[PDB]
Structure 1
Amino acid sequence: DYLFKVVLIGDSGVGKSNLLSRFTRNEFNLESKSTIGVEFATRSIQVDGKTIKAQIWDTAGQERYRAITSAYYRGAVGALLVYDIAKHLTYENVERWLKELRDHADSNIVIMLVGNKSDLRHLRAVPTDEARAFAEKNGLSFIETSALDSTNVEAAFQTILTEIY
């Protein structure tokens, strides 16, 4: 009975924890209940008429010691690389996360670029187009999600799990 390991990465405050709670329990929390360290939780999904088990990992990013960083990426078959569409700096940091994946993760890890906080359209600072072309260029999948209103959260996880299984 195998649990596919999928890691969340991206700047602190982008809603990674909320994506986790959406995917595992379909919950949202305005007051962040983000891990102070590393956390994981499990989900069962029907992909291609089959049952797939996934463990989604999340990190505060407060610990950089080599043993935990190696442990976080060890065995990961998928990564959701998350930014906040209302913060250009989070989008700029995606290259840093892409680099971290190359440095510590399996070279064949499937990567999905996720623009979270789609609900805040008025405060948008990252055009869909730009992000999309970056993704295409770097060989990533791309989706915009809202943890708050649940838009595309399941779809995001489904897509990655389809390539992983």
Structure 2
Amino acid sequence: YDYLFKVVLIGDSGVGKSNLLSRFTRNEFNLESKSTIGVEFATRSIQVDGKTIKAQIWDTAGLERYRAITSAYYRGAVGALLVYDIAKHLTYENVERWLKELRDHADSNIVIMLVGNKSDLRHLRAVPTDEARAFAEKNGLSFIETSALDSTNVEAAFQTILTEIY
């Protein structure tokens, strides 16, 4: 590989962080929900401008009740996929709290991509696309809606963030 980019997954529990990771790295998806244990790592390489970019994606549980995420989790990360569930407005409301967590524990120039996941539940949508997109605008973040289930935009989300990082 030519470059190794550490990118982390963050967002409320249940939003789809883990399946987003499995879909991108192993083209797999599981409907059985299992809260993530400790910190998980997955890798994948892609081509960007003729070069080979090794993407190292970090994943962890969204709940920080008894054990909160440290700067070590974020350390050296050049990218962050901040995820929420379009069907659960609460997970969208909490994005502000995650941005504060990034501000306090991650490099000030990290590339942050807001990800509205569970696109396939468009009929149960609680967070209008235009509103989220505008929000991403005002906060200087990239934005994209995905579906780890039907696979919509998953590759595009990761591909885009890595390219932005390049």
Is this a same-fold pair by TM over 0.5? yes
Moved more, 26-35 or 56-65: 56-65
Moved more, 76-85 or 43-52: 43-52
For residues 39-87 of structure 1, the C-alpha deviation after alignment (integer angstroms, 9 at most, x for no partner) is 1111011112221001001111455789961211011000000000000
Shift of the alpha carbon at 1:124? 0.5
Shift of the alpha carbon at 1:32? 2.7
Which residue is equivalent to 1:53? 54
- Asked whether the 8 Å contact 2:12–2:63 carries over to 1, the reply is no
- Asked whether the 8 Å contact 1:21–1:28 carries over to 2, the reply is yes
Moved more, 90-99 or 53-62: 53-62
Shift of the alpha carbon at 1:135? 0.2
For residues 19-43 of structure 1, the C-alpha deviation after alignment (integer angstroms, 9 at most, x for no partner) is 0001111111111355222111110
Shift of the alpha carbon at 1:104? 0.2
Cα distance 1:2–1:160, how it changes in 2: closer, same or farther (>3 A)?
same
Where has structure 1 moved over 6 Å in runs of 4 or more? 64-67
Cα distance 1:36–1:62, how it changes in 2: closer, same or farther (>3 A)?
farther
Cα distance 1:34–1:43, how it changes in 2: closer, same or farther (>3 A)?
farther
Tell me, what secondary structure is at the counterpart of 1:125? Answer: coil
* CA distance in structure 2 between the aligned counterparts of 1:96 and 1:107, rounded to whole angstroms: 16
- Asked whether the 8 Å contact 2:5–2:77 carries over to 1, the reply is yes
Cα distance 1:47–1:122, how it changes in 2: closer, same or farther (>3 A)?
same
Cα distance 1:64–1:76, how it changes in 2: closer, same or farther (>3 A)?
farther
- Structure 1 stretches of 5 or more lacking a match? none
Tell me, what secondary structure is at the counterpart of 2:72? Answer: helix
- Structure 2 stretches of 5 or more lacking a match? none
Which residue is equivalent to 1:68? 69
Corresponding position: 1:98 with 2:99: yes
Shift of the alpha carbon at 1:121? 1.2
Please provide the CA RMSD for this pair: 1.8
Percent identity, aligned pairs only?
A: 99
* CA distance in structure 2 between the aligned counterparts of 1:22 and 1:3, rounded to whole angstroms: 20
